[PDB]
């Protein structure tokens, strides 16, 4: 028996239930129920950001995201903290208030933001914090706080075919179609469409579905990934808010295609405000299943995460569902062969499954029409940052970056753009870069595009992402656990103004090791901001460094020669 086989499936939900503190009497109870020692349950709890909060009547987490910082979130955090004589990360002597930080909470289009007792509060300002202070000083329950404080917008500033179709059509209209009856037909439809994953890896969905069908095991699972954790990304938030019934339809179609008795929506903690809507939309789409009730119908279920970017990783998600820390698995065996509780399992992203509902509705020709040959279909783009209209923009795959940037109406003079979140590419806003088509074959993009104008320091942006990756690393494997920390600490030195050229060059071998020796995609991802920073902002960077004549054996230039100057599904799926 290894650590991996120490499963406790209901445990995550049971830990949610037990917090509405995690004391030795509550641990002893869960220890009984799941047949695991109390310290082992506590250890699993420690993995999750929101199970670590000191207990307090109001638990405020300011969003530590690059865009929120630009919109002045730090000053607001201090403004509230100062009123109660506490520092971020700690709690008042009377346990009334805890103030802390969390990573991007899917509110990049509505910065600056914070979560308060698991409820989002976007577009904060000095005025709101002053009112917030009054409510807390006077002990007013959140029941009675103005509902509009918690209102999350979902502005869509460009409709294309997919969005129009979602508005026009009812969710259950797809189940009348002939294709919805036949599992092989759905697979064939999706295959023909050329649908590639919208989670950020871009793996063909048909191939992934075939791997899961080719197993002898009758029991299977479809999992929908709504742990939208990539900073700057809110595309799945919109779909989950506006089009939940369509998602659950796409989950049922995907489940039938692979032969799954059960389906599970994995929803991040930060979107638990959407839970009542999703539950109601689940109820409704449960009854629209035909054929072939009652023994062939797919059960729909919803699991709530607890604060961990890495649990967005395919296998880590499953491990989380199995009641363990969210550590990516050692593969093979892959989840398609042996996944949730050993049974063949497919994980698909919210948008990917919504695309499936569309493809069954209007067929493969409809889909492949749009976008490029390799990158087929329409794509949702979540734009934010220094732009006049942040929000969702539907475009076809292959759209030039500059088109999408321009369509949002940039505020200052363009300077730099983060494509596909911190995992992707930091680019200077130059014509040749902006001409590049957003597609798997050219400049990949999960939809996230963050615009930064001339007021923004690229070195400070990478420092933000560095702290993110350092805090989010699951901690399982050497190069990522340690490398991510090395990068962050180098950027502490830069910010403190005593970093040398040696301090920077010595990261080169760490980046290489992270790229090559890591156990999941996180390790490659986490080196990209600095790699891009050195590729395109060398002089800005060097300007802040002291002199040092260190001769590297493996230099930063050699790391760049191996990467940007010439793939993520390599870690997640077997090969063809």
């Amino acid at each position: 028996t290894t650590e991996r086989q120490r499963t406790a499936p209901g445990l995550l939900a049971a830990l949610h239930q037990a917090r509405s503190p995690l004391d030795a009497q509550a641990l002893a109870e869960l220890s009984t129920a799941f047949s695991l020692p109390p310290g082992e349950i506590a250890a699993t709890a420690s993995f999750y950001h929101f199970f670590q909060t000191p207990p307090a009547r109001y638990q405020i987490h300011f969003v530590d995201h690059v865009v929120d910082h630009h919109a002045g979130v730090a000053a607001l955090c201090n403004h509230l903290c100062a009123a109660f004589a506490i520092q971020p990360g700690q709690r008042t002597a009377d346990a009334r208030l805890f103030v802390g930080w969390t990573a991007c909470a899917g509110l990049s289009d509505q910065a600056p933001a914070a979560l308060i007792n698991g409820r989002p509060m976007p577009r904060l300002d000095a005025a709101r914090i002053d009112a917030l202070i009054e409510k807390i000083q006077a002990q007013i329950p959140m029941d009675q706080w103005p509902t509009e404080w918690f209102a999350v917008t979902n502005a869509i500033h460009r409709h294309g075919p997919l969005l129009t179709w979602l508005d026009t059509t009812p969710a259950e209209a797809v189940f009348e179609h002939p294709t919805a009856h036949d599992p092989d037909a759905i697979l064939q439809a999706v295959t023909d469409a050329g649908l590639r994953g919208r989670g950020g890896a871009g793996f063909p969905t048909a191939t992934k579905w075939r791997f899961c069908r080719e197993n002898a095991d009758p029991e299977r699972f479809l999992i929908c990934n709504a742990d939208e954790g990539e900073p700057g990304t809110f595309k799945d938030r919109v779909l989950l808010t506006r089009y939940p019934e369509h998602l659950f339809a796409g989950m049922i179609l995907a489940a039938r295609a692979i032969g799954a008795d059960k389906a599970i929506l994995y929803l991040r903690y930060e979107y638990q405000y959407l839970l009542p809507q999703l539950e109601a939309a689940r109820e409704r789409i449960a009854s629209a299943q035909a054929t072939v009730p009652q023994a062939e119908r797919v059960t729909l279920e919803i699991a709530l995460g607890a604060g961990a970017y890495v649990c967005g990783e395919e296998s880590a998600l499953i491990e989380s569902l199995e009641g363990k820390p969210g550590r990516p698995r050692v593969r093979p065996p892959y989840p398609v062969t042996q996944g949730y509780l050993g049974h063949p399992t497919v994980v698909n992203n919210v948008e990917t499954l919504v695309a499936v509902a569309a493809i069954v509705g209007n067929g493969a020709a409809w889909w492949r029409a749009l976008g490029t040959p390799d990158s087929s279909g329409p794509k949702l783009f979540c734009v934010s940052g220094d732009v006049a209209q942040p929000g969702l923009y539907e475009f076809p795959y292959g759209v030039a970056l500059g088109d999408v940037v321009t369509a949002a109406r940039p505020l200052g003079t363009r300077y730099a753009v983060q494509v596909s979140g911190p995992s992707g590419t930091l680019l200077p806003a130059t014509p040749e870069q902006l001409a590049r088509p957003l597609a798997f074959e050219a400049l990949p993009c999960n939809g996230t595009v963050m615009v930064f104008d001339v007021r923004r320091d690229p070195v400070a942006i990478v420092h933000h992402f560095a702290r993110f990756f350092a805090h989010e690393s699951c901690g399982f494997c050497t190069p990522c656990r340690v490398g991510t920390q090395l990068i962050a600490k180098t950027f502490e030195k830069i910010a403190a103004g005593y970093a040398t050229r040696f301090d920077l060059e010595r990261l080169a071998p760490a980046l290489e090791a992270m790229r090559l020796a890591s156990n999941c995609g996180f390790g490659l991802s986490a080196g990209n901001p600095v790699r891009d920073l050195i590729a395109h902002f060398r002089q800005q960077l060097e300007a802040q460094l002291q002199p040092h004549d260190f001769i590297p054996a493996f230099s930063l230039d050699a790391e760049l020669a191996a990467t940007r100057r010439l793939h993520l599904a390599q870690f997640e799926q077997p090969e063809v």
Partner: protein, 178 residues
């Protein structure tokens, strides 16, 4: 012209210098090929310029840093000799703690002190660094000579290699961190 060597003992125990001395009568042979600049063995209070600088110890205060930087300027080749210079060694075991509390512990709190004993602070005592650092944190290091201390034979093999332009090599059996 003879090859010129300087040596420094910074935040070290002097033990890397005694291992250097453990070459024994080979020091007489060495003294024919080289002239010594600043060193704990010579009386030169100020360094340079020279061909090889052998640095024992890391940096624990601002003076150590000045000397180290001075030695770098002066020396063509600078060698980190021993664990302390290479990775901080024993002195850097204080880096797990705040140095202020350690002083208070030793100079005020300790039970065998005189009544009303105080942490020393005088213009004569130089500024303590927050953390003891290995020398490569400050300056460029051309060669690292591992051990605590590196053995006489490793020191002899190494500096003989440099004297004949031969590239130093560290094969498994001679390579030690203790």
């Amino acid at each position: 012209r003879k090859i010129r060597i300087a040596t420094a003992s910074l935040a070290g125990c002097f033990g890397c210098h005694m291992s250097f001395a453990d070459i024994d009568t080979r020091l007489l042979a060495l003294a024919e090929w080289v002239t010594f600049d600043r060193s704990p063995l010579t009386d030169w209070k100020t360094v340079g310029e020279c061909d090889i600088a052998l640095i024992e110890g890391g940096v624990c205060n601002a003076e150590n840093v000045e000397v180290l930087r001075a030695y770098r300027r002066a020396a063509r080749i600078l060698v980190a000799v021993g664990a302390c210079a290479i990775n901080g060694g024993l002195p850097a075991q204080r880096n797990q703690h705040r140095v202020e509390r350690l002083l208070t512990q030793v100079f005020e709190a300790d039970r065998h002190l005189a009544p009303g004993s105080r942490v020393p602070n005088d213009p004569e005592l130089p500024l303590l660094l927050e953390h003891v650092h290995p020398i490569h944190e400050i300056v460029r290091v051309d060669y690292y000579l591992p051990g605590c201390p590196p053995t006489a034979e490793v020191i002899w093999t190494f500096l003989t290699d440099l004297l004949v332009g031969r590239e130093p090599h560290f094969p498994y059996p001679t390579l030690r961190y203790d």
